[PDB]
Write a protein that binds this ligand. Sequence first.
Ligand SMILES: O=c1[nH]cnc2c(CN[C@H](CO)[C@H](O)CO)c[nH]c12
Ligand SMILES: O=c1[nH]cnc2c(CN[C@H](CO)[C@H](O)CO)c[nH]c12
Ligand SMILES: O=c1[nH]cnc2c(CN[C@H](CO)[C@H](O)CO)c[nH]c12
Lengths: 283, 283, 284
Amino acid sequence: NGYTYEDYKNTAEWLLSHTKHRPQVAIICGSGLGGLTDKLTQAQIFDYSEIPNFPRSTVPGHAGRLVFGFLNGRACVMMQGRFHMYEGYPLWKVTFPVRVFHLLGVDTLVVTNAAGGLNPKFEVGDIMLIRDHINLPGFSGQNPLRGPNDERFGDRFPAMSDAYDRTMRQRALSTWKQMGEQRELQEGTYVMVAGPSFETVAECRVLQKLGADAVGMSTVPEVIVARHCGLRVFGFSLITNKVIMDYESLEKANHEEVLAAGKQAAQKLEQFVSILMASIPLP
Amino acid sequence: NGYTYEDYKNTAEWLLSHTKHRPQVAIICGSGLGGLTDKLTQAQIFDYSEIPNFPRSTVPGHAGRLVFGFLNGRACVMMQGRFHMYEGYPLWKVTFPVRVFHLLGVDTLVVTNAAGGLNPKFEVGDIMLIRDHINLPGFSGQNPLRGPNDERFGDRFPAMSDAYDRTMRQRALSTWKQMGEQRELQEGTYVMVAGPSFETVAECRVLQKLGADAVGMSTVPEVIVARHCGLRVFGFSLITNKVIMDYESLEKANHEEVLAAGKQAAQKLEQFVSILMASIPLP
Amino acid sequence: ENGYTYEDYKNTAEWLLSHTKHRPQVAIICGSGLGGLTDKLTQAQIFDYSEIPNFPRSTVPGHAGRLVFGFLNGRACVMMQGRFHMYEGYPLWKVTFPVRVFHLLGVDTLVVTNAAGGLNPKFEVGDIMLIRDHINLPGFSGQNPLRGPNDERFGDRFPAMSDAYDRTMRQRALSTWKQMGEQRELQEGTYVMVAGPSFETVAECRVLQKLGADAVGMSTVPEVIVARHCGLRVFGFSLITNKVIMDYESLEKANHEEVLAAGKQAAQKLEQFVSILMASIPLP
Ligand SMILES: O=c1[nH]cnc2c(CN[C@H](CO)[C@H](O)CO)c[nH]c12
Ligand SMILES: O=c1[nH]cnc2c(CN[C@H](CO)[C@H](O)CO)c[nH]c12
Ligand SMILES: O=c1[nH]cnc2c(CN[C@H](CO)[C@H](O)CO)c[nH]c12
């Protein structure tokens, strides 16, 4: 880890000196989901370029801005754009903002992503509650907690079996009928894979049979640092495409599709997240 | 990646300046598969060490020579010997030649390799058509496309589910009867594993039940960057050993047995590659 | 890509060799909270890792950072009290460095010990599981200590691992167990190495279970691999210190404090088991 505690704290203090907003909740917007910053009231925007030690969003459509505001009674900071391992960033860079959020006094993180559907019962545009994850990069060494541990942040060995807040999940489930949607809110396991290339049929069949329900190349490392420093974590994927499972499909996965599915799902995601805010425990 | 796009152009311009051959098809030769250059007419030979940015071949069975010539009419360039991640090479060094072949004007890549049989039916000396792969190092971050993307080669997010040209595979299947062989032509999934040490029984069983028919430590990275820059890929393995699947056996994998079987099959490979050449479509 | 030369391993070996009178046949690597294994050695000689010219540091709790020479029960031993893990951010060629030094010491048998979370339903906390096989997940994807130029003088370019865990010793541990006097049986199974440092999620543990692995830890495999590289005989066992969380309704979680304490509970059992094992090891 090429960042000291002192690195995080300078970023954290820079923000505190540059905004009057004091966020309780941080929200990471995945591909094509940048539009959840739309309903924030009294919003103050920062380009990542502006912020000391911030990596940049290079993939479309990640805008690369940090937005402060109020959403449904809640003091929020939003990541309009995130970072990925496949852009060549070490995981301690990809997850850098999460520690700076904690230093700001954020106690809850919500992580959003576009994800390819593995489970046959998912249609495109489905929202899936992330119940759990499978961390393939982590299994083999790629874990943002590798190296010296700083107990000011958390333990040498934090458990991950309760990563996704059980209570918020139950709340979002029963909350769902207020969305008034003709489709049920999905629950499932997210599997992280590094990319940047999409998956083969063979690879999909393994993922599906590992028990994963959706696949993407993000999010998991953010969760892992978030939990390490004790934040409540809530996550959901938007199912942008169904991964190709047969060898006779002339169909192929593409980012264009995944950004398009993120646009169709704007108003539904806006509303879902809005509602969600109200269900977050006070400090 | 440590290579600028210009670094590739230099190697390409250099090759173009030192041979009048204009390859259409590129061919990468696996361990003990170097004999495939034998049938090139008007062959022109290069030591890898002559070619400005080329890595070296350190594994026995890999001659370290690049040869331009005509294979049964078709203008080819062959990698007599390849590179592996386990030699200490990053994947951007490993697959560097593919990128240069693309700039050479190569439109087709044939990847060859020796593999251990995971599928119970397969025998030593069988040729398996690679239909699809499972990229295990790719799952956890070891993918040659990691880092900034150069649009001059491909897209940030290329699909892989159509990696191994269907038509070429089907044609190879029709045409196998010309070989006058008593075994059939096999078709299956290659799983890439990084080694350099051979698999345990237990690892072999996970690989078997993941849906893999053959195992080795090469090829997939090459294929990923071939496809990323639009080349049509064809791939096959020579099954050189049956990987150990139980604890009572006193047999263990060794590279020497791998090169021994490469030598036994030299005539059939040459005869198969020949074809294969006749049916590669013109530019 | 290994930072160490043959000369480097050799300086360390010769340094130990002049600083001790001991000539160990056997090396034992103690896992988390298995350090208590050093206590039964006779005519002991302790070296801090920081004294030995090329050794790395042990950072994690339950790992003392010591090399101890002595006789276990007439058997000449060297024990690593503490070990190194990849998650501390060490290259695997630092993690495994002492294994090649033990080889140059004249050690021909290596015994690796670890604490592990049980994946197998039938394992109980406090069980000893003989390791028969492993699944090397960082290996699958590149993280293998042998990556890079091969040192010919230690071993082959592509060494086999299917025979890694000496069959005869395991059988002797099996038929000899009646000596231990436990109304629990000696377990046997496959160790799956995961990198860590965080513990596994439920779904992770489910994949690991269906991969056929019986016990999960974050160490051991790299040491085993380079042991066999230089042709040491290898024996492996896990202490099952916790049952891995396998369902969403549970309020329990894996924690390192529970791991360290199960080791302290099991010490007399391990002590006893390790000594009978030393009767099993073949003479040079
Ligand atoms: O099918 C998919 N396979 C893998 N990932 C994925 C995603 C998420 N997007 C990726 C980042 O994690 C990447 O930006 C390509 O869309 C959407 N759809 C898929
Ligand atoms: O059994 C095998 N397990 C793994 N790889 C493999 C190969 C291919 N050869 C390897 C590199 O890919 C390596 O050179 C050892 O043969 C032939 N046979 C096997
Ligand atoms: O449940 C576990 N999951 C992973 N590892 C593990 C161990 C072994 N200890 C680990 C290092 O290998 C780590 O020190 C935390 O205990 C004991 N119990 C477990």
